[PDB]
């Protein structure tokens, strides 16, 4: 109430205890996928949306249509989950909310996960997801690509992939707490680490090794904050101040700016990693951030 | 989608058949209260709100606090229901959404119903409800008073009661499809009646008899569209174009204007009676109207 | 400051003295046209607009392009002035502001005036102005027509003219203090007359006789508040509470609503006739009203 | 029009030739102050504002009151001008527009300039200015502190001075193209320098020498992008992508984030240095940025 988030303090402590448990006892991947799906799949979608599954040519996900939306405009969202877990199902509750806020159709897309499918399996999928969307008759200018953490990793990598293949860029990209350096470098590990109850250096190290499967962390397609960002589209990045991954957002911003790009960065005080995904626990900062992102997505698509 | 309401056509047909059933077979009061509670009580409240019951000094209802709201500002809402049915429980889903959109606390207040408690029992309750809120340490200029149909009836009569008792007015009133003439007069019965699938002349005639219990329809406290509106506060009125009650809204507007009041009237094309209460069936027009109303209530207490 | 208009009280007194002078001494028409042009033409246009004169086939006015505008969207504005005075030049300062607020191109159009050119000279011009605009490649759905007082008279008449000629309607019409009953009827003459410092029954009587030149006041094309408004487009009407012409706005609203139309009416407390035209004296209520109108024009054109 | 800035291309060319002239022929300080005052003093202030001079206890400037503003909320703005030139008079046109957009009172404050008054004369003034405003009975959380380039330098140093003197911070700071590193370091000198038509490395080097008068560039109070930003308030920074000073904005952002601050950074594609100060040449991007900044300042003091 009244401009403060009454839930963040409580949610942070829940995260502290939760992290202490996962640090002491590193659980099954297949097990954490189910429990992730179970928790998140149980969160009600945005009101008033039609959801249609997609399953054609190994391209898989869901079209989310807010009934108020402009159906000529598309958000392509890739869930996060360290490239280990997450799905369309789990992120439906967030992507639907972002769609309804932006007044656009969302493509809530799946992609192959590590350890079973290391780099470049995910990224090939993301490119195929993007081709799928273009093939529905959306022009590049009618697309924002997005994702949080690992999905943020894919979203940013896709743009680099499109540049390499000399292909036109979407209208923009929305990155939420994106993970853009799979070598875990930045002032924020040390500086924000005591304030980050959710994400540890150790966790990312492990997610990174499984994803790369010996591929170098220095590869820009793996670590987008190591790329030259010349000719990428407009960017909106949301990150929390209380995040080891803070530095990746600021660095990508630096590079985007240096490449001459329109780039907006909002670092939210007191916010933990991908806090909008946690709107069910954090309705004040989480919904307000979904509205901020929604408004940029909407402005960006014209 | 795309500016259009894809559900109103279908919802109107459901209402036609519904009305045809209730016209042919006039059901029990006690039965229709339960069925009304059951359907509307099942609609999820606005996300992220805290709801506390109220039951002291014959004042009964619910405080709804949106977690983002300003706790020093208050909406007092009276459900409609022809003064025969409806409750806090039934209207929770609407009043919560209105509160969340307005960024204010809602008092979702009960009042005694006809035929058991004819006029002036409900209005005595509404005044009690108003005093109760003031007693929580809200000043008059921190209150919007509100309600749809019969609730709109009470809201608007409350203002008249406050004027009679030479009391400060709230900062405004929000009226949704208010029923302001309990004699069922107006061009709209004939002009809009073939387009109104939900509200008949005959149903209101009946609801009016039960509420009045022999009291005159001419009495301004029963029929606010028969009052002189000198010194009332700012008004926002939403009403649908496809409503027998349309003329009551336009007349109250006329009178408000003639008394020199700030008055905003939005007649929504194609909209049926209290369509925002039906946001679960009408997500496009219903949520958009809740947002409109929310924006006004916020600007009004800003 | 702080939600009150610090200029209205002063401006009202200036109007009282001004009206007392014009009542005692009815001046030259040709003289009042120059002095009207002189005062209003001296008001700076909205910042950042390109203005191009139009002079082709007796169609005359100005294209106002806000540099931020969407050039596929058009406002057609007809100045008021009792059908005796006013011009593109005089209303440029208002129409430019409305254009810039709405983000659309404005066609600020001239039309022949009484006494030299009584009805239907003006209205023939308004229709030709509208044809001119369509011929620039604007579709009907990309047009709002508008005007204040007498311009409000023309705007509303044009819509009736389009219906008669079985021609498609524009997307909407914006009417500011429109004068829609050239017989001077309504509760507001008596009820608002002591509060209206600018517009008198006598003035309108005189403007009406010159315009009609024996044509009947009962003709709907002369008095749009006497028409059946079936099949007109969406409406936004702004009027002040302190206006003898208040009743015309409320009646047109009533009729629009009764015909099933989307109609928005905002009656502003304390506001005098066409107060947005007086934004140079009334920057609080005048600019805020231009923003309200701008936002509706923008929403209406998609 | 249509999303595009039709004037930036032309304005950039004017800046190229302007810079080429001043590079070849380095003009008088006293002369450039007059020419700067003459050009900018001629730009009309925001419509509807009251401006009062201030000259007491060595504090000098202007109170700008937008007639619609909230008089309990205040923006303190320091003009830029390389700490060599600029004045209240020159920046009136921008600060008035910012105030009018934000709905707050502006303190448009002077400060002593180099070479006559080197560091710390300006900063002593800025602190004086701040105290003066507090003394008008504004609380810290009713103040945004602001300035562009050199003004941004002072604004951001003021916050550091307030921290040193263990004083309450204002509610936020708005920095436009701030000059935060007076050693002229950053990737952007090389990366953005061919795209910056307005600001050269050489000009800043000179402005830095005159301001420092032998003081070290390393001093945080001179170079805020060298400070630790612990406990500063919320930040909004606008900077253009085509600016040698881009890196200073990104670095201050980095530091703010690392100190845990709420920080919003908007890098505008194609925009030259302090482009909102050039709204008279750049109405599309300049007014849109004033509105963005205004919206933030309003939300911040809301």
Numbering used by the authors:
A (entry chain A), B (entry chain B), C (entry chain A), D (entry chain B): 1 to 302
Task: Please share text taken word for word from the publication where this structure appeared.
In this work, we performed structural and biochemical characterization of the PMGL3 esterase, a novel member of the GDSAG motif subfamily of the bHSL family. The protein was obtained from the metagenomic DNA library constructed from the permafrost-derived microcosm. The PMGL3 esterase demonstrated low thermal stability with rapid inactivation upon incubation at 40 °C, which is typical for the cold-active enzymes. The PMGL3 demonstrated a typical fold for the bHSL family with however a unique tetrameric architecture.
PMGL3 subunit has a typical α/β bacterial HSL-like fold, consisting of two canonical domains—a CAP-domain and a catalytic domain. The CAP domain (residues 1–42) contains two α-helices (α1 and α2), while the large catalytic domain contains 8 β-strands (parallel β1 and β3-β8 as well as antiparallel to them β2) surrounded by 9 alpha-helices (α3-α11). Two PMGL3 subunits within an asymmetric unit form a homodimer, which is consistent with the current and previous SEC data. The dimeric interface is stabilized by 10 hydrogen bonds, 4 salt bridges as well as by hydrophobic interactions, thus involving α6, α9, α11 and β8 from each subunit and not affecting their CAP-domains. Further contact analysis revealed two possible tetrameric forms (T1 and T2) of PMGL3 within a crystal. T1 tetramer can be regarded as a dimer of dimers from the asymmetric unit and, thus, has two types of intermolecular interfaces–the dimeric interface, described above, and interdimeric interface. Analysis of tetramerization interfaces demonstrated that T1 has significantly greater buried area, number of polar interactions and free energy of assembly dissociation than T2. This indicates that T1 form is more stable and presumably the one found in solution, while T2 form is a result of crystal packing. PMGL3 tetramer has four active sites each made by the residues which belong to one subunit and are buried into the protein molecule. The oval entrance of about 13 × 7 Å is partly covered from the protein surface by the CAP-domain, allowing, however, access for the substrate through two large holes formed by a “bag handle”-like arc being composed of α1, α2 and the loop connecting these helices.
